[PDB]
Amino acid sequence: KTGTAEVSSILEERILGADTSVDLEETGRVLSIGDGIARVHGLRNVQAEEMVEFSSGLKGMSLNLEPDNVGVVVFGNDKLIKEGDIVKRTGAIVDVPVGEELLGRVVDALGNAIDGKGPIGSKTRRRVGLKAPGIIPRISVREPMQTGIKAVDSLVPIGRGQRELIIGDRQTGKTSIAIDTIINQKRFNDGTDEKKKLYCIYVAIGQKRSTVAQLVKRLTDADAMKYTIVVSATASDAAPLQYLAPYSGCSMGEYFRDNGKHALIIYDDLSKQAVAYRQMSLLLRRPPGREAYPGDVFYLHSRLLERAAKMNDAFGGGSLTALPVIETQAGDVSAYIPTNVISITDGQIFLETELFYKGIRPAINVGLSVSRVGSAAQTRAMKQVAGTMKLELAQYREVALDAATQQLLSRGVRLTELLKQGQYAPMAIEEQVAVIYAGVRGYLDKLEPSKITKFENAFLSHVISQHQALLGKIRADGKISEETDAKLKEIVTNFLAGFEA
């Protein structure tokens, strides 16, 4: 019991007359600094979670109010701050600029541009600490969100408003699923049907700065930076800037959801956020738990991933889809953090590090990948064909010269090689449904397994040209009728007679 503000520099202000030329209601000093937080004396009208401003130009959040002092969490570095400064009160809860006028920029976590293109031109500001919608305004998912990947769109289907995990080890193809989702929306954002438009947000937490820069080129090379925002707190940024990065990233997606538009956000990754919240907790001397984590890690990721919801038709009809990324250490799906997020999201996608080495790419574990709520929201053209491939990929997995074994071991390898896909080649929905058709209706059962990657690149390149006007009725009518599948029988069996083995 010695008091934080029992020091002689504050007793002297009181013992030499109650001084008049100090404000002590909207501005205060800084008593100590260095472990992150600062001990600010004064500021007797500050709110909780209210952004303040230092004399160096740094923003800080008012976290912890006490009868003596205020503890301010400092965004950015804490070398610029000195004991004896003066800190000003802004007068608002921590909020970020948000609007339609951000599509095409690269901001940092506080909402300032770091691409060197001038100011942003925003008019509205939403808080970062808002609550999720309740039980009434939500409704079940019904519109499908295409991926362009032949393994995801037919085996673990996604829908507009469904959380979906992407979990795997290092260098297994995690980010290359998230990039092909953004490039695949080129076909919808440049059309006339406004009800199928979809924007994108990318949040880069703890990555290298030179990997984000080689990523915004790849989006600009494919005309995908005109509907995409990027928030960036890389590995050289301070620890409060990585903790508050997905909150400011999700508050820019909550704008489109409440105003009838559909959004999409990729957190990459939520593992490096929880090692940044661990650092701020133990530097405040809080009791650690399992793996030296604080006790409220579950509050950190649940209050963020509860916002991604779909409103009803009386609230506009928008949505918000999330796709977080978790990195596991040597296949450990039974650790503390990859179980706190499995028990939140509505499914999983598993990336094996020992199928990525055998040459199967993308290395999607089809046995452990599930999507609960998003199965009822997919195209009936896809459900008519991929419902059959779900059966044969199961019968290939039990048998791992006998009768009823060398038949399924023949077909079950031709469907595994049918689900390989090159990088940065997002396919349309109705071009998938012809390639999965040939592998499950029994047409390529005679070919060799090594000459089937050659077969898909030859059949698609011709039916996109000579039967282009006859493929559009799959995408327009949304189904395979009795006239389309009788027509589709002749396209393949005439191509196998011309495909030189």
Binding site: V46, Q47, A48, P67, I135, I136, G295, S302, Y336, D346
Partner: protein, 466 residues
């Protein structure tokens, strides 16, 4: 009495009074907010100062704000008018259908029933699931646990028990969602409307709903299991009826007490929990009892963190249960749903007097052939199958069909695989485990026993793979 907010640290607000110190567990009202912030007195610190715990977000509190004492604990609307409605932690309607109109109000913190009110009746609650009928049967009027990790089926199973038991029930029902997905709580409200359990035109509804979910502050998840409990005490005491009480998930009541116990200034115990961990669970759990007036049949659902059954939070709730169904993931990898551990599921009514002398003898033969198979897995994995005896190529060849006969296609999982939901009677899950333990079906493969109902469909499946 009016007070001034002195310190705000997270979700714990400090308040200094000037006259009229309010006693513990009283509710306070903060003056000057758009919504309704209500506190809860938790300690007395001396110098005329209390220390509260807030029931909503404390963003925007100025040191010097005025707070007004209510004079009584948190009282919620209770009665038969709360049926077919949704209530939050402090009993406000969150379903946009108007206010709940009742006549009497009941406090949240009530004491436990005494020693001379405990009834000692034991019965059997037949469900329709083959694993929990045979090896660990359910008693009417007693508590039931459901342990498991993250992703094994603790909610596909608890929505099957609602589909079987609670739909044909004659009494009342209470669901209390503590810390689950808010999109799941929307689906439960929108399935009871189509199936006619909740009705929005007349007054024949049968179930109330209480909800404090995972996006709520820690002060509001630590007190919502007392609210769904106090609703189901009126339907037992002041009406005399047989109720049901589904709570899911009850670990979030324990987790959200450790988040706020660091801010209250305590020394922490083992792996990171609060020191008063087993004092305040026994104070909560000894209010869910079958007394001499009515029967509360609680079906809880407990979470096991990092698949560790020695963690103090799922290892202090084992002293409060009658039945126990320990789910495991290593059975769920093989495709056996529900993935119930047969050798870890216990029961209290398993006794040769109550369930009989024929039920008790087949149920102990199943746990004998599955334990001897478990002692040979260290040898079959190294030296293979061809190193056993000839009589021990029959314990293996029979336990690998009883394991697959403890699989069953559920009714709520029709939208997963597209198979029909099957229900069996209790008298036919005794006959199925006699014609396997005797050796009547030693001419069928193991995969013919996979995902069927009674024993007659097993022979109607082995003719297909001919």
């Amino acid at each position: 009495a009016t007070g001034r907010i002195v310190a705000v640290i997270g979700a714990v607000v400090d308040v200094q009074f000037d006259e009229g110190l309010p006693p513990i567990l009283n509710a306070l009202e903060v003056q000057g907010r758009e919504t309704r912030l209500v506190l809860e007195v938790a300690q007395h610190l001396g110098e005329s100062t209390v220390r509260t715990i807030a029931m909503d977000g404390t963003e925007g509190l100025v040191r010097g704000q005025k707070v007004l004492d209510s004079g009584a604990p948190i009282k919620i609307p209770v009665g038969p008018e709360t049926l077919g409605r949704i209530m939050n932690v402090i009993g406000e309607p969150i379903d946009e259908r108007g206010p709940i109109k009742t006549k009497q109000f009941a406090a949240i913190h009530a004491e436990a029933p005494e020693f001379m009110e405990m009834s000692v009746e034991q019965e059997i609650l037949v469900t329709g699931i083959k694993v929990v009928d045979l090896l660990a049967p359910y008693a009417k009027g007693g508590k039931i646990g459901l342990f498991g990790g993250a992703g094994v089926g603790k909610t596909v199973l608890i929505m099957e028990l609602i589909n079987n038991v609670a739909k044909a029930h004659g009494g009342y029902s209470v669901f209390a969602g503590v810390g689950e997905r808010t999109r799941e709580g929307n689906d439960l409200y929108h399935e009871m409307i189509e199936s006619g359990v909740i009705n929005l035109k007349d007054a024949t509804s049968k179930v109330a709903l209480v909800y404090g979910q995972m996006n709520e502050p820690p002060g509001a998840r630590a007190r919502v299991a007392l609210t769904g409990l106090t609703v189901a005490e009126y339907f037992r005491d002041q009406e005399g009826q047989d109720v049901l009480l589904f709570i899911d998930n009850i670990f979030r009541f324990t987790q959200a007490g450790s988040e706020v116990s660091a801010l209250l200034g305590r020394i922490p115990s083992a792996v990171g929990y609060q020191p008063t961990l087993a004092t305040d669970m026994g104070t909560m759990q000894e209010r869910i009892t079958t007394t001499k007036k009515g029967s509360i049949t609680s079906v809880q659902a407990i979470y096991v963190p990092a698949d560790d059954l020695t963690d103090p939070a799922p290892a202090t709730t084992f002293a409060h249960l009658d039945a126990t169904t320990v789910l495991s993931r290593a059975i769920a990898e093989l495709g056996i749903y529900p993935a119930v551990d047969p050798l870890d599921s216990t029961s209290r009514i398993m006794d040769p007097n109550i369930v009989g002398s024929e039920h008790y003898d087949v149920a102990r033969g199943v746990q004998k052939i599955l334990q001897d198979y478990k002692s040979l897995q260290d040898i079959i994995a190294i030296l293979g199958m061809d190193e056993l005896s000839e009589e021990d190529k029959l314990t293996v060849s029979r336990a690998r069909k009883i394991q697959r006969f403890l699989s069953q296609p559920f009714q709520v999982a029709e939208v997963f695989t597209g198979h029909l939901g099957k229900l069996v009677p209790l008298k036919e899950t005794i006959k199925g485990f006699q014609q396997i333990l005797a050796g009547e079906y030693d001419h069928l493969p193991e995969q013919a026993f996979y995902m069927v109902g009674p024993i007659e469909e097993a022979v109607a499946k082995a003719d297909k793979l001919a």
